[PDB]
Write a structure and sequence with these properties.
Chains A, B: It is an enzyme of class 2 (transferase). 2 copies of one chain form a homodimer. Chain A is α/β, with parallel strands linked by helices. Chain A contains 14 helices and 15 strands. Chain A has 2 domains: about 260 residues, 3-Layer(aba) Sandwich (Peroxisomal Thiolase, Chain A, domain 1), CATH 3.40.47; about 150 residues, Peroxisomal Thiolase, Chain A, domain 1 (3-Layer(aba) Sandwich), CATH 3.40.47. The structure holds 4-fluoro-N-(3-methyl-1H-indazol-5-yl)butane-1-sulfonamide (2 copies) and sodium ion (2 copies).
Chain lengths: ~425, ~425
């Protein structure tokens, strides 16, 4: 039976990471801000909140907006997520030394929650006003939700596959999972993978808050996102995009790249329970964690750290607590980064994967913000108060998205 | 080195197929219509063609509309592709004997070109008219492009993974590719896979026809789609959805299921050349065919049949002819089903996979319609005039979608 530990799968390592965040456009500055207890969630000064009088008035816009890095050409040639993907794709490649890889062994897997939706309603109005010939010949390549991954593959020259998984909150983690599969199956030796997502706007807020899924603690924005806390209220939006560079260890050593961590395995299961709510028993979500251990060659005892999905909805954290217990990783140190960075849907799984890698690299877990009164039903060892320095050897990043999509990524210290 | 032929991968077989089509809502009636030279492409009697005076006035609506099978509940609870997915999901399961499988070994992989887009502009207007509280709590689960696969997994009880690949015209084939991967890697023993796509409307027509990509031969609708013909004019829309049931051969024999064909391998590459146009040399597209042979254990000589992508654009068919030659399958008998069924984007790769399976089962290839004057630059053995009965043992289905996404599925007679 093949596994990473017994050589059945080639060793895959992470060699570069990049992310834009409500705390910082630089991933290393975001890391240091998280360690200092910073939060990216503030009061929304956007005019659409006062216009429609939204139930939620809090959220985290990117510290550095994507369009401040975009000229007129990009503003009409690409959708938002494509523009975010081009920005992150370029920053990731330079951060990795701008290597020259074999294009036929180079893949791209970038997930997203929805895609270039704003370009559909724009083309809707552009033809209602002037007719069918007033729709741009570039409209198809902007609207298609594979567009972000397509521009990244074209910009970097990836010819071993350009793929876009879609599974809401797990899209970014699932992208890293499939990129790992594309490598261990022999189709590629190096891959850019992650997730991108659109900005906070009025319609996304209205749709999610009508599910009673979002926190409404508008008086203290930095204290609204309270994963595993008894005063839970729901999740808070926090914009993000994130990409990582993974490659076989053989490929990394031959180019002189210093690996940040090891990508050991990936488990994908599904609940088949409800269209938006997770299964309370957490059985299938836990099986995804178990499956990532099986492919990696680990046991629950080896898991020192779990980067939780932790959206801070009442039923979400309760289900994940059961899932962690079902997987047998209840003794692990748990971090819920959505306490500080919020929820970025199609990108957050990729962002939290980057944070998992940094935790294994520096041997430190940032504190879960606003964890002050532990929920009696959730008995987990969550890091809080200050960063916890520890000897973390293996970690699992969880992402359980709407629709019942469970992705677990098993990571190891290099 | 693992392969299907040398036992490195478990044997995977196709046990049931279902499709709705511009010719028939029944896949067996569609097959018989194709063999009799029927076409689903007619003059569009929709009022939006006269309203905007579209350059194209031809296309193939479904013979049996999806919403004629939908009550009021489904018309507000689901988007179009979700409704198509529920219809096809239910028909496929009954056609397979309604088996009772282990939910933890059952996966669903359903691709789509875009998703529930019509529900975004609907929620856009619903809040402009009444405010944020007038957006349905079901809006999120209708809009998310993973929605069709989500309702199919929930309806049939698939708990080993519910996934949605997005890659334009190759989405439906890529879904079958990932479902094959999910099985040969040990994560599942049975999978429902295919693709769904929305109907023909004015905006899709305007966007694609402004790329000069669509045929404008409105006087003879049944003769507009002319793949590999010298009088090529572009592609024609033809609505479709298709699903197939695949499972390990061990799993099929233990339940008494008669396999229709074997799914032997799948190759995914990318061009990284242009956002909508395929590479002229067809090198990466041919490598996807080669890769499916490598995983299957075949050589170009074993390929008797190629179900071509064949959109009938001038540059598309020229690039695929080079791709087939690059892969070394130039002596194979080529079928271009878009000549009769048109192009259904996210679903067509799944539909043409079903047609490939039926070709191997019945030993017959339908004629490529409107192939009357062979393009001098495309020297391929395309089936034309009447069905060609032959001893086809192995076939490859091609799907090269916009964005440079190349998927090749290698199929074998059971
Ligand atoms: C707005 C918008 N314009 N274009 C988009 C494309 C995708 C999404 N996705 S989203 O979930 O609604 C945003 C929530 C993430 C908050 F950090 C939104 C938009
Ligand atoms: C319209 C519509 N409403 N909802 C949709 C969801 C997806 C798509 N896809 S499409 O490419 O534009 C249709 C082209 C296929 C022709 F057979 C269209 C719609
Ligand atoms: Na996590
Ligand atoms: Na084909």
């Amino acid at each position: 039976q093949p596994s990473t530990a017994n050589g059945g799968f080639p060793s895959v390592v992470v060699t570069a990471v990049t992310a834009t965040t409500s705390i910082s456009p630089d991933i290393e500055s975001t890391w240091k801000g998280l360690l200092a207890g910073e939060s990216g969630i503030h009061a929304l000064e956007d005019e659409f909140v006062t216009k429609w009088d939204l139930a939620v008035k809090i959220g985290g816009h990117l510290k550095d907006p994507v369009d401040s890095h975009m000229g007129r050409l990009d503003m009409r040639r690409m959708s938002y997520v494509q523009r975010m993907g081009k920005l992150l794709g370029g920053q990731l490649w330079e951060s990795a030394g701008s290597p020259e890889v074999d294009p036929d062994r180079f893949a791209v897997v970038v997930g997203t929650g929805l895609g270039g939706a704003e370009r559909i309603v724009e083309s809707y109005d552009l033809m209602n006003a002037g007719g069918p010939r007033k729709v741009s010949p570039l409209a198809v390549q902007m609207i298609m939700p594979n567009g972000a991954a397509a521009v990244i593959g074209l910009q970097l020259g990836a010819r071993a596959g350009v793929m876009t998984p879609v599974s809401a909150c797990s899209s970014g983690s699932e992208a890293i999972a499939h990129a790992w599969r594309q490598i261990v199956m022999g189709d590629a030796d190096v891959a850019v993978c992650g997730g991108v997502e659109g900005p906070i706007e009025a319609l996304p807020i209205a749709a999610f808050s009508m599910m009673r899924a979002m926190s409404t603690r508008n008086d203290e924005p930095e204290r609204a996102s309270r994963p595993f806390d008894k005063d839970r209220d729901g999740f808070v939006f926090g914009e993000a995009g994130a990409l990582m560079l993974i490659e076989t260890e053989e490929h990394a050593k031959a180019r002189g790249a210093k690996p940040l961590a090891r990508l050991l395995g990936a488990g994908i299961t599904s609940d088949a329970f409800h269209m938006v709510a997770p299964a309370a028993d957490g059985v299938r979500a836990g099986r995804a964690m178990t499956r990532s251990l099986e492919l990696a060659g680990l046991s629950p005892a080896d898991i020192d750290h779990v980067n939780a999905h932790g959206t801070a909805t009442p039923i979400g954290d309760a289900a994940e607590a059961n899932a962690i217990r079902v997987a047998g990783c209840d003794q692990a140190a748990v971090y819920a980064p959505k306490s500080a960075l919020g929820h970025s849907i199609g990108a957050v799984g990729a962002l939290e994967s980057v944070l998992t890698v940094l935790t294994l690299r520096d041997g430190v877990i940032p504190p879960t913000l606003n964890y002050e009164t532990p929920d009696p039903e959730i008995d987990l060892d969550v890091v809080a108060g200050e960063p916890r320095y520890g000897d973390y050897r293996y970690a699992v990043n969880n992402s359980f998205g709407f629709g019942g999509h469970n992705v677990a990524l098993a990571f190891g210290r290099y």
